[PDB]
């Protein structure tokens, strides 16, 4: 019953519009949800041009008969989220709807390079017989790595697990990667390392037992 | 000032029973508005699930209501969600929500023809699965200065092989949160959860304030307080 828009891009600190299509809104009209991964929905706008407090200016929107936008003007990077549009049916029983959201793309946000940390097992897990290393990888931007593991200096073919790269509050990205040894595997080698490569560069980080 | 927290278990079985509460803070239930429960499943939208008002009646998604049920308990201020013969189409994070009164009549005060949904909890994670509880192992990552900045150090916890999502990780009860970073868990070839959670540190204190991360399991009822000790 409630149609949107499922992608639109913008071009950082252009204005965007967002549109919503429904019979439902002839009655109660539109609301606006922003909605980011690992988080709730916060509503930024709703009816008349109303604005909750803590939503920024740079947000409005209006509904006109069976038809909604919402605005962003000035778009910044904190911005780029799934929008979804929300209204209340007229009809029968007059249900809550959701349209199917709306997938925000801003481009041209800057470059940022990764740091790379790598934690060595601990002892008292070497002590529960098992080992794992713990590569942690923040502040890049865009979210795209390649994570790769070397035992001395050969290839780790098992035992890698690396996350899918998520936001930070900054609007960079993080991302972590794992490789589970046993404590023979461990002991066995010289060293470890990490080896993470971001947009052509790389940065390499190794452990020692001791 | 209105507040909304879910509580619930994150763990069910198929064809069991879903059983949610929202407990309502900074205002009373016993008002006009429409206490609502909204689910996210994992890389899809938002579904509404149903709503009901004290004193008045329920309304729910007409998919899910040969399912769910709403329930209200004016005694102690909250709100309930039961989902019956759950499947893995029910998994996701599960929230509840306020809606404030609308008229289907002429004549009312002008707020009362929009529909929004105002308040939001935080969310509760539910998992359906066959597979049992496990609670997390949790490790201490000695504190190390190679990738800070100058005069900080890094330490902080692994939370390993826990089952299901999620855990919760405070440093010193809550007293540090400047220079905490909690990474999304992954999930291993195991089927269990892992994460880490790190704080960037003044070296000059590594010797002299004590660091505790405070991890939280709810699915597992497992709490680990772990010390992080620089090593030697």
């Known amino acids: 019953e409630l149609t949107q828009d499922p992608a639109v891009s913008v071009a950082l600190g252009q204005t965007v519009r967002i549109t919503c299509q429904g019979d439902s809104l002839r009655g109660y009209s539109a609301s606006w949800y922003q909605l980011k991964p690992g988080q709730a929905p916060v509503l930024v706008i709703y009816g008349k041009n109303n604005r909750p407090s803590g939503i920024p200016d740079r947000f409005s929107g209006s509904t006109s008969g069976n038809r909604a936008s919402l605005i962003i003007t000035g778009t910044q990077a904190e911005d780029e989220a799934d929008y979804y549009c929300n209204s209340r049916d007229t009809n029968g029983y007059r249900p809550v709807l959701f349209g199917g959201g709306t997938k925000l793309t801003v481009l041209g946000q800057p470059k940022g390079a990764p740091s790379v940390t790598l934690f060595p097992p601990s002892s008292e897990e070497l002590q529960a017989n098992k080992a794992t290393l713990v590569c942690l990888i923040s502040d890049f931007y865009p979210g795209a790595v390649t994570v790769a593991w070397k035992a001395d200096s050969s290839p780790v073919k098992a035992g890698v697990e690396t996350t899918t790269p998520s936001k930070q509050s900054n609007n960079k990205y993080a991302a972590s990667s794992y490789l589970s040894l046993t404590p023979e595997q461990w002991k066995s080698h010289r060293s470890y390392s990490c080896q993470v490569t971001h947009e052509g560069s790389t940065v390499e980080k190794t452990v020692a037992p001791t | 000032q209105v507040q909304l927290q879910e509580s619930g278990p994150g763990l069910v079985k198929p064809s069991g029973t879903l059983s949610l509460t929202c407990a309502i803070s900074?205002?009373?239930?016993?008002?006009?508005?429409?206490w609502t429960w909204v689910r996210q499943p994992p890389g899809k939208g938002l579904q509404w699930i149903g709503e009901?008002?004290?004193?008045?009646?329920?309304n729910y998604n007409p998919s899910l209501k040969s399912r769910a049920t709403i329930f209200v308990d004016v005694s102690k201020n909250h709100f309930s969600l039961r989902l019956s013969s759950v499947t893995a189409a029910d998994t996701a994070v599960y929230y509840c929500?306020?809606?404030?009164?609308?008229?289907?009549?002429?004549?009312?005060?002008?707020?009362?023809?929009?529909?929004?949904?105002?308040?939001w909890g935080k969310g509760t994670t539910v998992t359906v699965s066959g597979a049992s509880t496990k609670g997390p192992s949790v490790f201490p990552l000695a504190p190390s200065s190679k990738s800070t900045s100058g005069g900080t150090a890094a330490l902080g916890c692994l939370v390993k092989d826990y089952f299901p999502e999620p855990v919760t990780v405070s440093w010193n009860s809550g007293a540090l949160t400047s220079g905490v970073h909690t990474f999304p868990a992954v999930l291993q070839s195991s089927g269990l959860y892992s994460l880490s959670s790190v704080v960037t540190v003044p070296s000059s204190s590594l010797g002299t304030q004590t660091y505790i991360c405070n991890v939280n399991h709810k699915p597992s009822n497992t709490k680990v307080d772990k010390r992080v000790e620089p090593k030697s």
């Open positions: 929500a306020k809606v404030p009164p609308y008229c289907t009549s002429a004549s009312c005060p002008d707020d009362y023809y929009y529909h929004y949904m105002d308040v």
């Open positions: 900074g205002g009373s239930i016993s008002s006009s508005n429409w």
């Open positions: 009901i008002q004290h004193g008045g009646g329920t």
